[PDB]
A paper describes a structure:
High resolution crystal structures of 4 and 5 in complex with JAK3 were determined. Both compounds showed the expected orientation of the hinge binding motif featuring the typical bidentate hydrogen bonding pattern. While the complex of JAK3 with 4 only revealed the non-covalent binding mode, the structure in complex with 5 displayed the coexistence of the non-covalently and the covalently bound inhibitor 5. Furthermore, we observed a yet unprecedented binding pocket formed by R911, D912, and R953. This unique feature is induced by interactions of the nitrile moieties of 4 and 5 with R911, thereby generating a distinct cavity in the protein surface. Structural comparison with other JAK3 structures reveals that the side chain of R911 is dramatically reoriented and forms a hydrogen bond with the inhibitors nitrile and nitrogen. The guanidine moiety of R953 is flipped approximately 180° toward the nitrile group of 4 and thereby forms the ceiling of this arginine pocket. Alignment of the other 16 available JAK3 crystal structures revealed that the orientation of the aforementioned arginine residues is conserved in those structures, confirming the induction of the arginine pocket to be a unique feature of our inhibitor class. While 4 rapidly diffuses from JAK1, JAK2, and TYK2 with residence times below 1.4 min (lower detection limit), a prolonged residence time of 50 min on JAK3 was observed. BRET experiments using the JAK3 mutant R953A, as well as the double mutant R911A/R953A, showed similar affinity of 4, suggesting that the induction of the arginine cavity did not significantly affect inhibitor potency.
Janus kinases (JAKs) are a family of cytoplasmatic tyrosine kinases that are attractive targets for the development of anti-inflammatory drugs given their roles in cytokine signaling. While the other isoforms of the Janus kinase family (JAK1, JAK2, and TYK2) have a broad spectrum of functions in different tissues, JAK3 plays a specific role in the development of immune-competent cells (Ghoreschi et al., 2009). In our quest for a highly selective JAK3 probe, we aimed to exploit a non-catalytic cysteine (C909), which is not present in the other JAK family members. C909 is situated in the solvent-exposed front part of the ATP binding site, where the other isoforms possess a serine residue (Chrencik et al., 2010).
Author numbering: 814 to 1103
């Protein structure tokens, strides 16, 4: 059931694109009559050995995960020729949380944002128990399964920690979403479950601003960077963070949630709460808001 025949996968449209891959909406149509189930299918482009190797990793991680808060693996496909590997996932037609928040802001209250926050945290706790660092976590890669249920997706940068080490180091990335990453990741290329906690803090900021473009992390950076304009953003960001500057509390954000953000953004990775510690707090806040 987990091998999809490539000649039965029918392309419909593009769901996502990165440097080295794309996720495409397809129909799996073994009967050839356009009645089959729809699926989301990842494949690589511009890929070298490192990219192919990372994709094999991504498939093994996603296949092993079984959480209500992680996008479901369905299977794999291989065509003829080479570079033929495809990853088949469930398709969630409500799309990403970033877009959903922007579209429906006026009817999504703080209780609903608290629900999403709790669900994302549960998915991250699941990941943590499997020693998996997600790295990419952001509203643009969390999917909406229904209006009261979200799931973590985009495992393109996910990695398992070795059994005896609590972090990994990479060679410097070419293109990082700098406003989501922990300072030790930006400066020293160190990633861990604690860098993921930093990014989750930025996710909370995204949720409680409804991903409004006027107060996006980049927009806030550009306001806070000061009157000197032509300074490289990464260099300046790292200075601001080292000075202790942080994203502001969204006006509508509950004070307790802002305090959690600040804890997620502790300078030392060891001072940040674990997802296991954040979950009960968000759960308490969500259940208090019903
Ligand atoms: C241009 N733009 C507005 C965006 O790209 C964006 C934002 N912000 C996010 C976005 C748009 C569409 C999707 C999307 N739908 C999906 C539906 N079922 C799916 N199953 C597995 C991945 C998946 C889906 N993805 C993404 C595909 C790439 C990885 C992240 C999820 O996410
Ligand atoms: N985590 C956090 O506060 N990051 C940040 C700070 C200033 C501007 C943009 C992003």
């Amino acid at each position: 059931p987990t091998i999809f025949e490539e000649r039965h996968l029918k392309y419909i449209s593009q769901l996502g694109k990165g440097n080295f891959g794309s996720v495409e909406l397809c129909r799996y149509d073994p009967l050839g009559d356009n009645t089959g189930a729809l699926v989301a299918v990842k494949q690589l482009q511009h890929s070298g050995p490192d990219q192919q190797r990372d994709f094999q990793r991504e498939i093994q991680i996603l296949k092993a995960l079984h959480s209500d808060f992680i996008v479901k693996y369905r299977g794999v496909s291989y065509g003829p020729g080479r570079q033929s590997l495809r990853l088949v996932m469930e398709y969630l037609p409500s799309g990403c949380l970033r877009d959903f928040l922007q579209r429906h802001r006026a009817r999504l209250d703080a209780s609903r944002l608290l629900l999403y926050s709790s669900q994302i945290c549960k998915g991250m706790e699941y990941l943590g128990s499997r020693r998996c660092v997600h790295r990419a976590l952001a509203a643009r890669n969390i999917l909406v399964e229904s209006e009261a249920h979200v799931k973590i997706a985009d495992f393109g940068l996910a990695k398992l920690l070795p059994l005896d080490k609590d972090y990994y180091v990479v060679r410097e990335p070419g293109q990082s979403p700098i406003f989501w990453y922990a300072p030790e990741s930006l400066s020293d290329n160190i990633f861990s479950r604690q860098s993921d906690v930093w990014s989750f803090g930025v996710v909370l900021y995204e949720l409680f601003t409804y991903c409004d473009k006027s107060c996006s992390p980049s927009a806030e950076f550009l306001r806070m960077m000061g009157s000197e304009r032509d300074v490289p953003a990464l260099s300046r960001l790292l200075e601001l963070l080292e000075e202790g500057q942080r994203l502001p509390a969204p006006p509508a954000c509950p004070a307790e949630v802002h305090e959690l953000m600040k804890l997620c953004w502790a300078p030392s990775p060891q001072d940040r709460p674990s997802f296991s510690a954040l979950g009960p707090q968000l759960d308490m806040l969500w259940s208090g808001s019903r």
